[PDB]
C-alpha cells in the first residue's frame, strides 16, 4: 500500500510535464535542452612527482 | 643500455653550505651545456684539410620555472640580489631521479649568480598556472654518477 502523498515525496519525476517562463510572460514550448555547467580544469606537474 | 626518462627530477640551492629544503620542486629545468670555444685556422699550402685551435670552455645558463608560491630562502637571495643589494652566490646540485629516488646522475655548479627573475602574464582569459622564471649564471659544472 504505497499513498499518493507517499509517492509526491519519494518517487521521482518525469520530464513531460513542464512550464517555460520566457522574460514576464508564459510560453508553451515543446523540448527544452542544453541547461548544463562546464568547468576548465587547471593542472600543474613538478619535477618530484 | 636502458634510457632514463626526463620528468623525474630534483635540484637542491645550498646558501651558505645550509641546503634549502623548500627549493626542491620545479616545473621544469633547462638542459645543461658545455661548449670548447674554437678558431680555424688554415695554412699555406693545405687547401684540402681543416685545423681547428682550441681556446677558452663556455658553460650555459641554468632556467628554472616554478608557480607562485609561499616565500622561500630561494625567493629572497633572488629578491635581494634583484633589489641592488650586494651580490652572493650560489651551489646548485642538479639530481636525475630512478625509480627508488636513488639519483643516477647529478650535476653540480659551482658560484651561481641570480641575474633574472620574471613572471607570466596576467590574462583574464587563461586557464594557467602563473609561473616564475628564474635564470642563474655560474662559473663551474661538474657531473658526478654512475649514467650521464
Redesign the interface.
Known sequence: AITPEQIAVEYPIPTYRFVVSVGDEQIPFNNVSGLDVHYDVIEYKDGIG | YTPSVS?????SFLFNNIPSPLD????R?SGLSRELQTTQYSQGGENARNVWLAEKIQHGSLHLER?VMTVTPLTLMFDRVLRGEKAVYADVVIMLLNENSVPVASWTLSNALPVRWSTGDFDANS???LVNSLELRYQDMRWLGVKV
Not at chain 2, 620528468?7 to 635540484?11: E, G, L, W
Open positions: 620528468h623525474r627530477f630534483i635540484a626542491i620542486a620545479f616545473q629545468i608557480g586557464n594557467a598556472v
